[PDB]
Nucleic acid binder design. Sequence first.
DNA 1: GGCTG
DNA 2: TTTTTTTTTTTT
Lengths: 119, 432, 432, 432, 322
Amino acid sequence: MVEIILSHLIFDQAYFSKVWPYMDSEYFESGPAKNTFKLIKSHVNEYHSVPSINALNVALENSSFTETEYSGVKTLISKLADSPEDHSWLVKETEKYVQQRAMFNATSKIIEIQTNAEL
Amino acid sequence: MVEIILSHLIFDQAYFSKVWPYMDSEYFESGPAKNTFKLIKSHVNEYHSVPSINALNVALENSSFTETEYSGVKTLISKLADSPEDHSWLVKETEKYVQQRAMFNATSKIIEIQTNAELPPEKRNKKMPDVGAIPDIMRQALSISFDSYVGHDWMDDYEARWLSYMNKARKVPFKLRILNKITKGGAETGTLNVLMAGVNVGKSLGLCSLAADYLQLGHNVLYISMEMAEEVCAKRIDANMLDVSLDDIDDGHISYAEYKGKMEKWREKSTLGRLIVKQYPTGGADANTFRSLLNELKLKKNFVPTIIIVDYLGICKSCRIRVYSENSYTTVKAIAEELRALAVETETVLWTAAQVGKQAWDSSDVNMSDIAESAGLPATADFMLAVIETEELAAAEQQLIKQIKSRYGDKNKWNKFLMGVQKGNQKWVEIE
Amino acid sequence: MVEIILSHLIFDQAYFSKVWPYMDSEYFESGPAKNTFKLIKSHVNEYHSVPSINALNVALENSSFTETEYSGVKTLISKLADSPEDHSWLVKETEKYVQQRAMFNATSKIIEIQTNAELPPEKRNKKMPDVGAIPDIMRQALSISFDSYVGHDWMDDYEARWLSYMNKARKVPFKLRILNKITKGGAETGTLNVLMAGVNVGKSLGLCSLAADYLQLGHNVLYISMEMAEEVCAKRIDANMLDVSLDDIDDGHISYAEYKGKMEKWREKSTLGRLIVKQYPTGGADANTFRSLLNELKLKKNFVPTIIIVDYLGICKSCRIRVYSENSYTTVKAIAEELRALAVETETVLWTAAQVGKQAWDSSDVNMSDIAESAGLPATADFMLAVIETEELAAAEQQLIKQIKSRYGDKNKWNKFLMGVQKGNQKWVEIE
Amino acid sequence: MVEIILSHLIFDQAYFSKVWPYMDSEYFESGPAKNTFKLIKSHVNEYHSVPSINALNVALENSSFTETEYSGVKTLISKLADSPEDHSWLVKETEKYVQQRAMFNATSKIIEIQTNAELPPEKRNKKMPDVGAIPDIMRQALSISFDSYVGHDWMDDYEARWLSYMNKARKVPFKLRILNKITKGGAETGTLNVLMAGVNVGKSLGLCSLAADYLQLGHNVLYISMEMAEEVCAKRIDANMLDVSLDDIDDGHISYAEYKGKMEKWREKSTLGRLIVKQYPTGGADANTFRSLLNELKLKKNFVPTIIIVDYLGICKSCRIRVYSENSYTTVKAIAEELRALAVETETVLWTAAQVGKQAWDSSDVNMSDIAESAGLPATADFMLAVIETEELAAAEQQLIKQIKSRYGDKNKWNKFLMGVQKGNQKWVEIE
Amino acid sequence: SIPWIDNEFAYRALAHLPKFTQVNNSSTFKLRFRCPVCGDSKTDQNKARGWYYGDNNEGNIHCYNCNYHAPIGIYLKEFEPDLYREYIFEIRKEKKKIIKSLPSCVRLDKLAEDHPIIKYVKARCIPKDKWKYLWFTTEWPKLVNSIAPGTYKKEISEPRLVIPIYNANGKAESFQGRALKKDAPQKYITIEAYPEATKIYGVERVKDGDVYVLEGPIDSLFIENGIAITGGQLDLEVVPFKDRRVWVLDNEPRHPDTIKRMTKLVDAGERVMFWDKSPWKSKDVNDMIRKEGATPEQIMEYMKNNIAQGLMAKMRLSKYAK
DNA sequence: GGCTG
DNA sequence: TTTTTTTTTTTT
Ligand SMILES: Nc1ncnc2c1ncn2[C@@H]1O[C@H](COP(=O)(O)OP(=O)(O)OP(O)(O)=S)[C@@H](O)[C@H]1O
Ligand SMILES: Nc1ncnc2c1ncn2[C@@H]1O[C@H](COP(=O)(O)OP(=O)(O)OP(O)(O)=S)[C@@H](O)[C@H]1O
Ligand SMILES: Nc1ncnc2c1ncn2[C@@H]1O[C@H](COP(=O)(O)OP(=O)(O)OP(O)(O)=S)[C@@H](O)[C@H]1O
Ligand SMILES: Nc1ncnc2c1ncn2[C@@H]1O[C@H](COP(=O)(O)OP(=O)(O)OP(O)(O)=S)[C@@H](O)[C@H]1O
Ligand SMILES: [Mg+2]
Ligand SMILES: [Mg+2]
Ligand SMILES: [Mg+2]
């Protein structure tokens, strides 16, 4: 549910205040999701506020992205919307997603470690 | 190497007595290998002995398998021979194989646990553990080393320990009563002993004196020189043994007749051993060179040295670290560890010298902190004595020896004792 | 015959004992042979035993090289088989093969060095040795003959040792009586002697006096100045030999007639060698540079020195450590060790100067701990003499020489004596 | 006109001697011309003479070049030919070509600079100048004419020196006559002036008083404070210039009406400069930071200071040093050298502060050996002053200044002059 | 970086270089040229080992002869300074054909059994029913020039196995030639009718269930729902059935390029196939059948059992890598 | 007939 | 991040 996480990071404030300090770039797939989160994180680090859609489209144009990456990020930004839901299911779902991503990254890392050891 | 493991399970009792304790059907495979191991396990369970090829084939006929598995098991069973490989390599390789297969199984298990966790609670299986069991699962698969020995018990093995108290074969006497008194019976085999002092104080003098004393006791002594030539050190050994002088040798005061007579008289003695002096260029030798030198010495002559004297550890060169890869605290300690490993492998008393920093070159006393090279050398060392000489001492020809690191005995019972060093004869003389 | 060598390394314990110590990875090939030998060497280093075919196959399966290399190694291992042979034909053939491969590698490296040095700088692929050590590498290609010298036996080899005491060709006498007395016959060839004085106390006046004294005793002297011009050192030697003060030469109190007469009178004397002065920029000469100088002196000038003198070792460059990489201790110790190696190689008495620390300047006594740039220099030097000058000594035209490291004799005896240095004539005179 | 330039470099001595010292490889092209000029420059460096055609196409062209480069260089060398042209037109055309190429290179460099700075960090190609130093590059490119200006000839440049003398175009006079009679007209432009007072003795009252005097003298003053905020330093300046006690501005005895009236009375005066106070964290500003601050002030506020006052030299950091050093001698000396280099580059009188040693605390006299942080700081300073008001001068509102190092005059002429401190108003007044 | 201005500027710089060819697929921009630094191969005058790759973040030139590797900006700065000026300035400025017939091609199922190509395809052990998906020709350059003229200058008669590729509609848009002779310019010559043609063999034969994607079109003939990408862009996107495709490559555990493609596929979260428990040892499934006596339905049994995805695919790849 | 890092 | 030589400096 990366699209929902990004949408409620941009368009919601309590969700942003609750989940932002724990989000990391490694929790997103290497496609449009990670680049969009990179743009959001850079904007937050530079201005200490949640960017809007216009801010990110400005940040996307002022970015060193390939054509495929640019198209993917633009499509993902276009797809974002504020779907009204409850701020008790979103937080737990985001926590579950982050835990799953952390477990996946740990599994990949230990597989790489075992492959490296046998060399 | 499943074929080797199965062949040496069936055809080797020593291998079966060290690996069968730690062996499971999950470790081998999912095909013919697992079925063959299952047949072996079933036969050993029903009858407490290692099965033979004929018995294994009869059991395979009795047991039921599908056509493919039957053919695979028959083909695998056909491929079993004695093949007497080395035991150490075999056990190490089977330990590695077991560890890697266990790690693979643990990784697959945790991947299955993670996949099952993402399933809805209705669909998920209750037999698979929760994600919280991921770490310990990966830890029990890292503790499958092959080691059945648990160690001493202090109450179930006090008889064996008392018998070990009576095994004094490790001790080697010193030919000097004070050194035997302070070492509780002399130095021990496989130990790194160091004789440290300042520059031009008598470190090589002490090494040659120890070499001569061990030679007169019947030991085989291997002197490895790193600065001096072979003939120069042999001159010091001659001055110690023949007991005339160093200058008189070079001043012609010794008539060939006397030299030949003394050498032949020492040859007639049956209590004399063998001494070989080997020189190496500075920074060009270590245990790797020393092991090849040992092998060549043993092959060429019936010479297995009991005492190995290294002229200086510092002048020596580390095996793994390059000539100037790292600083002194590392490579010096690495050379010390390699020398101690060589000594414990050859079961020989290893003697070497050490340099002292400039802070104690003119001091009446020297401490362990006054080691010019790494302080790891006074960690791998066992009996690090120290030689201190002053003007008053040199007037009486009496170097002071301070007990710096005493692992054999009490370091402070006789901390400082005077020796009777004769520099002309390159000999240490006890004082009574 | 690589297949035979590997096969008899596997299936012959006697063959492995002699050939192994010498076998190296650079003697077989760049393909299957080198990979198979690397497998065997790794197994030997890990288990200290010759691997079997099963062990080689297991190590091959646990290897990371590509499909071509894997297939080549598998074919080579499958082709290995013991054959009825005789130890001698195999050892001699292996020696021939190893020598040929060593020569081939040496000439390939020589061509690589030549084609690398013929490149513009800053693009010459550094860490490659210069052309200067082209012949030495070839000298390493010829010193491989399966005949490693085990060492010197004290009792077995003592006639050869005794035919080294009255030979006395190792010792080169001084001209001053006190220096001969303290060294018991003078300095020895293949040594490193050092003068420690400070700044502007002596230490090059002493070197020039030694050069003049050796020159008068029919010696070929090679003065090497790293901090002074060839004409300043020659002027010092002229002042010493001709008994004319340096002030007289500067003030023109000596005529051309007297100079010519003295030079011709010295020339007509049979007891006089040849002195050659060579100047290098500070920090621009090393042991390899000195060896190149020796070679070009032998060829062009038919000059074979025995009393090679270097003005200051601290001013020279290490031939192994990159400049300003290691501290003063390591660099100076390496430089001194390389100079001693050169001296033992060419069998010459090597004389050098060394600075003392700032704390030793203007002091009535100089200790061994006052050495300036390294504590290893006293450890790697055969003889050291400390030159001490105070105001009272300067007013008396005398200097106190203290024996700091006396490897040719006992330093406690005659530790401090007063030389009569005459600074105008750059000469040392005795007081006896 | 590359071909003409090269042809008359090869085939004209006068043109060569005129234009060669101003030639650079970055002027011709990225093809055959650059390679030909590289060959010519290498030949001139190696042999100090103009190469011929044979030297170019044989001794030099046989080098590490590709086929296309080799063909281009061969064609260009074959195309070179001497042509009769006047040696006033050739020099002028060459100068115009060099100026055009310098402008082209500068434009390309600033384009790159802008392109690099547009990129986000972590890919910003460090060591490349920032966008602020674009105009200086263009100005340097503009002044690339062929005029010989290497140093200051004593006899050839006495007119400009006398103009400097009569104009006194180095002195910046003080507002205190006592500091002008010992400096012979005040401090000089490219100088580093230091105050040493101790702990809570002054050392910022003096700097603030000097800043206030320079402000009243119409100078632009930049106060870089490392130990105090901008507001507190500006409050001290307000106390100095408004004749109001520093406590009165805190308790509230001064109304806003009179404060604004005094500020506007100061504003209407044409003899008033601009004072800008900038604060940096203690230990987080170097000479590069000060240069960036100067560039920012010049670009944004159009502020080019003539006086730079660093509140404390010892709590800055060194731009050259990359790893912090526990040795205060080297760090403080490097900081002082960098500050003086900045002062001489910007032609700004640089005042700073230094801490005295604890021994000098409550000492009626402070010598130069009482400097605390480093002994190299007094060596780099052009003028030092010491404040030694111990106990009795405090009761009389006095401070004694010693003049420890004076490069503007003899420090033994007026060593002590007993300055009239006023701590409430934070100022210095004379005792005339 | 700015990729399209690098593509535009690089082209002009490499246009001067001889043997200049525009290798431009649907998603990449490459330029083939003779290397100007070394002159490329001295022995072979027709080799163009200099390449420009502009599909990355930065367009880079790489020479496979003299090992020159540089950005396009460094190349322009060092060799074309007049072009280098405008290049760095312009930075600030911006900041279908269907194969309807196959002439001289005969399908293999209507050919006589004593034809020498029938003996070869019987030696390749292809099942008979697939023989209506394969043609044979002796005028392969004439056929290619009939489809795409100008690629072959002289139409020398070459016997080759025709491999038409149909889309999901079943319309032939490309065709591959398998070299019958051991000496050939290329083992597999793929010829397209229009540049956006599909390079996946046999998409029209996909039934329900998992779709097995192989590397050889002949290898896919033993496989139910077996299609095969003919190299080209190897784009997973241009490959349909993304939810249910099976990624099968040749059995090569020590080959670095094969494991590189495995790592690229498993990092994308795809369903990759693993030969780590295979009883056979040949490189491809056709070689397994021909040399190791394997029948196809055993192979349909093995792969389905070892289909892998994600993390348990990664650990397998870890053990299959060496 | 392509292939880099 | 420690370790060891040498030096230079400074603080107590
Ligand atoms: N056999 C012995 N008899 C009497 N005292 C002994 C004997 N062995 C050791 N000691 C004393 O025990 C002291 C401590 O020795 P240890 O227990 O080995 O200390 P340590 O720190 O372990 O030494 P290491 O491991 O070599 S650093 C020594 O300093 C000796 O004085
Ligand atoms: N040209 C000269 N005339 C007279 N006396 C001289 C002359 N040159 C040197 N001396 C004296 O010789 C003494 C020692 O000279 P040197 O041998 O050069 O000293 P030094 O130790 O070699 O100098 P460094 O610091 O090691 S390079 C000086 O102190 C002078 O008294
Ligand atoms: N030829 C000799 N004749 C008499 N005494 C000697 C002779 N050579 C050395 N000595 C004495 O031996 C003492 C120290 O001997 P060394 O073995 O040289 O000491 P060491 O330097 O620690 O050992 P090294 O450096 O490995 S040779 C000196 O102080 C001399 O008094
Ligand atoms: N607000 C104030 N009111 C009155 N006197 C003050 C005030 N602040 C500082 N002073 C006086 O000014 C002197 C302090 O010197 P400063 O100019 O502040 O620099 P400094 O304190 O010597 O520098 P350091 O490094 O902080 S000791 C002392 O004589 C104080 O009594
Ligand atoms: Mg010694
Ligand atoms: Mg000198
Ligand atoms: Mg202050």
